[model samples]
Target chain A: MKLDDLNLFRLVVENGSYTSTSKKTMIPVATITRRIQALEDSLNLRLLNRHARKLTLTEAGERFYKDCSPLLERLASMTEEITDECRGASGRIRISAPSELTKRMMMPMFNAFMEKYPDIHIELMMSNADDLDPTEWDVIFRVGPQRDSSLIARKIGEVKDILVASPQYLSSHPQPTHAEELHQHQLLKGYPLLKWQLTNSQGETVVNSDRGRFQASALNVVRSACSEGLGITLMPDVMLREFLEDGSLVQVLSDWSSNPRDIYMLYNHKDHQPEKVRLFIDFVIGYHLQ
Target chain B: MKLDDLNLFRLVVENGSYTSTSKKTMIPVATITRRIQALEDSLNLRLLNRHARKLTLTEAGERFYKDCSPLLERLASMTEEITDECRGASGRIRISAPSELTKRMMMPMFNAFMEKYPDIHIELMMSNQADDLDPTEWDVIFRVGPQRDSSLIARKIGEVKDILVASPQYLSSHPQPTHAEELHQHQLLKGYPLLKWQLTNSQGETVVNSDRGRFQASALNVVRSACSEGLGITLMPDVMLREFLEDGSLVQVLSDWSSNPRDIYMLYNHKDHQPEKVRLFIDFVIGYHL
Candidate 1:
């Protein structure tokens, strides 16, 4: 049982109906029912006296509510206190970022931020799946397009997708001069290739579309696979820059690459914004701009 | 403030000293001071009368405590009731798992389990990091390895490991080996040579060496992909190679030879009575051979 569940129970009893509580709390009726059911099951006693026309608290539930209500109210006031304290720049900055960038990019940025703002703490949740709600995190660093426009987004950088392969692979395989010839060679794909719009130096365009023989969900896996002489793979230039310079992997089709994807810093539109988030976003933008 | 904070305030007033309150709550005296200061600042009213030897509740603090104690006691009972209900088999089951396995394996398992027990709702958290503990909603987690964490109870599942694989092209170019002895003659693929390949031969004995190859890779995906490109034979799990096998891009060798079995474990703490959701998951995994 969670603190939120107890508070939810209080809300339900005070409102006297799931529908009423749902309306007030902005929680769906079904969800409220499930939480309540779970709460009741956890308690092993019926907390609510339910009816079609009206709902009331059971004797056991009545006693539970009379006991829990003031405490919940007190919790609310304490929350308000903490919330006020958190308005300053020194507090936890909870962020959600794509895993690859979190390691390759955000880690350095975070390290620098922490050094500058020693009082601020960062809690980063690294994930690949794009389904994120702003409520879960204070800020999110995203690649590709923004799915939810209601949230505020600041374009931080561009991710250039560059094709790379090991020097050994190139020695044995036929080097492709045209985009269409790429399909002939074994391709190590992660986030698998579907289609790419390739443009040449002569202002010619070609639509390249095919699946790679090897596939993985992580960019790191695809990149490592490419470096192992598996096949040519598309990778972010930022990730491959060191590999290319070190001659472990060579850039192929230098003139041709899929269009650069924009990187963004996303946050919910809040009325009373914290100084920490705003300062961090500005700091990141400044660092990336350089 | 919070019921706990108010209670702490009451404790301070009754005990009349930070030292006394700290001893009673087991919270440090400095922390108590900070909390009380923050509470007073939040309410914009002084809640305590403090001296080196004495501590007393101001009018506001006295009123808050009188109104909050009975409610706190009632909440304690309701919490007990909820904790009791949590022991049963139905409710939300929150689990953390590796992203790849959660997507490819657990999603199907979860779908089937949900179909069987419609009352059990699931909240799944996908991550690659291994530093989580059984706090918050994370009652159980899936991990690869037998790493010992004293606070966790681990249930070992079937061992998972890759088998020696090569593209059919490579096998055709070099006659397929009938035994591990023949692999010595073939070009060896190398990566992470530190890992000893424990293969169980037809004789039911373990071969702990002779799998390291000359060509090395930084990652497992790299090694596997290189094998797919006809570089040399390498080991990969059956599940990861299904697409390649189906498409006939790669073939498994030595049906009787098995790779090192790395066991996957489901971990949880043993303090609380196992909830129904967690108990059912344990049963389902054992039944399904996951």
Candidate 2:
């Protein structure tokens, strides 16, 4: 259980129903139900005595609340003491970022962000699927276009796809010198491709060689297979830069590459962001630029 | 572009035929022909006089080879040196695991490994029951089942046991429910898949889906947290609740009931090459007294 669950329990006791506490916290009613349910389950107490017409606490619930209320109230005061204005560039910032950029890009960015601002705590929710709710996250980094205009966006940089295969695969199977030659070699695809795009020295688009022996919708599977010396596959460079540099993988078809994809850093509001949040934004963009 | 094409050109010049160059480099003969054609086409000079059986450099090819070969060979050596240095120094390994097992178990294991090899970068994608054995993505995947796609191999690592547990305070308020029949009034916090708990006491067998559930969560950690707070009774891995059970914060009830242990397997694909980082992890996992 989280400390927030305790505070939430106190709030629920003050209010009567899950809906009342949920509306105040902006947390969904279902989650509140589970949280309070978990609280009572862990301690093995019936914290609430409820009926269709009214709600009340059981004897055990009242005794626990009386013992815990003052402590929670003091924690609130302490939280207020350590909150914004008083401690300018501190506290936690919840950041969401796609898992594709976790290894070489955002994770390293997080490492440096932490080292630079030791007091500014951060939590990361790395995922590919996205949802937008200003109250849900303080910051988010995403690949491709930002559809929601409600959140302010900053173009961090571009992310591109590169064709890479293990050194052994390149040694045993021929490396493609031109984009067209890629058709002859074994290819691994995520969601078996119909066509792929690449630009060469002549500015010609080579949209060929889409057939692959292995296919999966999960991109990580395609990448993992490629690393296993199974076949060449197309994946984001941000995810494979370490492999490219380390001798584990080699780029095939020089002077030809897939189209560039743009990545952006986002925040719910531009003006109301805390000092710690702003510093992180500045550090990330600077990291991208450099 | 600089290294690959130049290396190809030099190979063609040293070996007298495109077929001969292709035989040694494993680069497709057609690719070798097109790349040289591209080089000459861009240079505005004919670089090779070719016949079915033999190849000889034109005046421009002779001059290009004379000026570029020495530096090109040096570059090949330099590239090998760079690869070897980074090869032994670092690697970023990605792993997939169940989220419920992460905090208490897998994370501590990772912490020990990380401190030993500071240069190694590990990225974790925690999930539950979801399977995607992508070689292109993860160096290793932790899964529960022995059955896997033909591409990967699985090794049994350990077994996880789940037991009925509740808070001590809760047992005082409610009966021990030692017999499955008395469990009718107890609210159960359920973990998915275990949607129906089949518990076997020495006497006989019993199944529970009761309440159909008052608290159900996809993650055991959620159930674990709630079970500790005195909410309701729950079934959780004993490994996770050992501290709580020992401290008297919670107690195991319905002592006669039990569930079969679930086996854990770590999956990795067979490959010509495996990353050093993954090998280290495998050894640690295998040697750590499963």
Candidate 3:
């Protein structure tokens, strides 16, 4: 339960013995042993097997350490920030995002932003799930609506879906004037769906009745594959913009497209947000809009 | 044991109707419908709710599908391997790798290999947490550093030095360290946990920052991104930093020193005879120059 005690516990875990941890910390073996005993007693759990040649965590101890380390790191960071840091617009911002979003949207912007604020440090992570605890992250950039939300969503921008085919493919094949005729060509899974929602003035029609050779979840791969004359695919116009301009790709199902999805930066209450998070958030808003 | 019924069940679920399943598989529509019904009877659970438009999975069926799909996918490839093991090099190869490595290094080789052997299809899944990477599920597990599974034979395809890299933007603001010991004074964009950079050259090994890192991330690329942003110096595989190096976005620091040389490995379970598809891909990776 005690911060210093838990710190000793991890050092003991990593170092593999009380003496080694004591030697590393200059805290003496007796104090570390007694402190870890205190930690074990406070939790009413058998935390370690000190009888072993190498100190080892008990089941409870293993679970406790696994859960405790991140929290301690958070504490250590918080302490650093609370004491002497933030003299300038400076501090650590732990940002989480899926690769596709960040690689496409943020990295270049992050590069430029960080160059301006030389003092601000960034700890970036891939958002596999929204497994981020409130204290774990400062900002998370995600596509579409936050399926589950407690977090405030700030609209940075949105990407509209457009159907595209390589001019090479189009030259070899007939253009899909209607949805029903789309079955003749190979389709790329550019938009992570077997059922693509492409609506026009008539109403809604979903293509992808026939599966494509490319079914990857990777967005970058999907665009390249489409441009390589793989098949017709539904993707964002932004991705196909250069392709369109260069005649690498031509718009297909011109009147049809699925709903455009907004990209948002999610964060907790702004009032509670630190200066670093707010500044980055503001910068993103200003830069992305322009 | 009606296992083939499950295969029929896959066809039905994907095809969206028994009639469509019949069209694809050359099974009679009524017979396929009855087989599905019989499969429900075998389990005493209805896998689909027979509908006016199309059959939809029940909650139990959806859960059953979730559980069954991956296994069935594994089984389908396995049966193909079973048939082809005594023969040719063309079949499906399920590959697992970290995205950064695959994106930066192996993907082009894979594409080239795929082009040469059009019959060989690949399923590349991003490996983040290797918690459930069962030997039965994947054909080849490509990873940086030594693989831990004893049952899996770790073949060293190549060795890479994780060299310290920083942008001119970062180096301009901070004094570049000529020696590894001076690395402690500069900002470190550390990847993942514990932030241990154990550097070694011909002289000896010098560990950097057991204390704490300035910027730390669970995502490796975030560290690379931060380093590029001029936040700090971080270590990365030269393959990942190739473009950055060529484009002047990054420069190597302490080229004589590096974090312990890590061998990139391809791990697969030991067997009497490896599947030709797996072997072919493995050889491609092992012989790959980049």
Candidate 4:
């Protein structure tokens, strides 16, 4: 409960030992011990599971850390800003998204952005937390279809998912002649599939339909297999353009395509957003986006 | 080159002086100085340029640190796995992608998954990375049109893409026109303008050729503005369905026709990959990637 206890707690957590925490902070061992004891006494909960030289977070400690860590980081950022250490457009930008683009796309952008803005720090944190709070992110970029109504966002672009396979894959097996023929092949576990949102020439909405068996996660593997002619596949255009250009992969049902997916940039639309934040939004929508 | 030399060089860089580094590492200052000298001699490059208490990385030192930091982290993870600390499918999984899907379809699947696997750590590193590599990331999970030839992929599921938007900007400033006339009045961009893919249906493939723009970073903002009485929008099914279902937005011309876009996944291949890592691939395809 004491103000200093939080700092003590953070140190203990980071150093993973009472002795190490004391040594690092130059605090007396007794003082370190008393601070923790007082905190536990105030909260009426045990925070650490001390065993000999080992120090571990208790069940309650783990919960406390999870809940308090963000608040602490926010507090620290606020203090740092007040002290003017957070001058200019600088601070760690925590971002999140699905797995593919982390390597395929985001890294390159960060790499370039980091080079230009060496002072602006960035911490890439990817969590599989569903329905995560938008406030947790400085910038949250995602694909598929934007869903959360709570977060404010801007659409960046869209990608087209197409059915494809490696040339080697088709060479070994008879290519499915139609959408229904796709059931004969083994699709990956969690990959997207062919979809048709049929509309008339009058530009009026009509039917929503899907094709092929349910595909799974390793669509890239399925694609690799297809490239090796392992089997037929369906994927998006942006990813396959290189393959289509080089002839390593071929589009199946080049005539039959799937629904398009949009790209969006999101943020917690909190009041009093800073200038740099707005600058980023404008840069994204006005420059990189438009 | 002794490993100790690298450590000495690193310490000097961090501590700013041989004396300080020596004090911190408990090595004699003379020993630290000698080690740095030896490292510089071996590399045939000056690691630092020191002026009394102040020290600065020579260009070589800066480059070395930049290149080695990630390698060191990779080394650290390797050491952990060797030590058996990472015993399961746990730890933050960082990912990036275009923004829309992060909001819509992906989060629902992730929510269903977390209810089953709670111990696993998750981090979504979001960004509009244009789906490229070099982010030094764990994985990238995305959907696209075709299979790329790069060895960095896993599977290709199917195809999907977009519809056009008629924002208020275009409609109010110009005359509201039919599908063909929609392109004539609008400021064409990739978010909606290029209806170029030849989509196949029960009716047959229709060539939707049109000149267009390829940049736009925030689909939600554009679509929202258009929906909130800005302009008519061209969006993909998932995002479109989300807005359309809300009744705040409408699907305009080309509502009946589908565009060419494929859904695919790109990931790091783990041939002999550990079960925990492999689990991600399993969950993606098998559990939720629709």
Which predicted model would earn the best TM-score? 1
Q: Which regions of candidate 1 fall more than 4 Å away from where they truly are?
A: A1-83, A192-209, B1-290
Worst 10 residues of 4 chain B by lDDT: B269-278
TM-score of decoy 2: 0.39
* Off by more than 4 A, model 4: A1-77, A80-86, A127-129, A189-218, A270-272, A287-290, B1-290
Q: Pick the candidate with the highest DockQ.
A: 1
Task: Give one digit per residue, the lDDT tens place, for model 4 in B1-290.
Answer: 23336545655776778788878879898787776778676554666776535787876677655544333334334434432422355554555544555556456666666656676556765444444534234444554443244334465533335554554444566565445434544554434222343433435546453544333434544544544454334444445355653563443545555665656455543323323533554555554445
Q: Regarding DockQ, does 1 or 4 come out ahead?
A: 1
CAPRI-style docking class of model 2 based on DockQ: incorrect
How high is the DockQ of candidate 4?
0.01
Please give the TM-score for the first chain of candidate 3: 0.71
lDDT, candidate 2, residue B216?
Answer: 90
Task: Please give, for residues A1-290, the per-residue lDDT of candidate 3 as tens digits.
Answer: 34467667876886778876664455788988788878665555455766445555654466556655664554444333432222336666778776655765678789877997777788787653544465456787877775567887788888787888888888888788887677777888843445676777878666455667787766678888888888888777776787889888899878776788788888877454566777788888788531
In candidate 2 the C-alpha lDDT for residue B77 amounts to 56
TM-score for each model: 0.46, 0.39, 0.40, 0.38
Off by over 4 Å in 2: A1-290, B1-75, B78-86, B132-135, B203-210
- Model 4 lDDT per residue over A7-72, tens place: 477668977888766644558889998889887665554566553245667434665565555545
- Estimate the overall C-alpha local distance difference test score of candidate 1: 0.71
Q: Give Cα-based local distance difference scores for all models.
A: 0.71, 0.69, 0.70, 0.55
By TM-score: ranked, best first: 1, 3, 2, 4
Question: Each candidate's chain B TM-score?
Answer: 0.55, 0.69, 0.62, 0.53
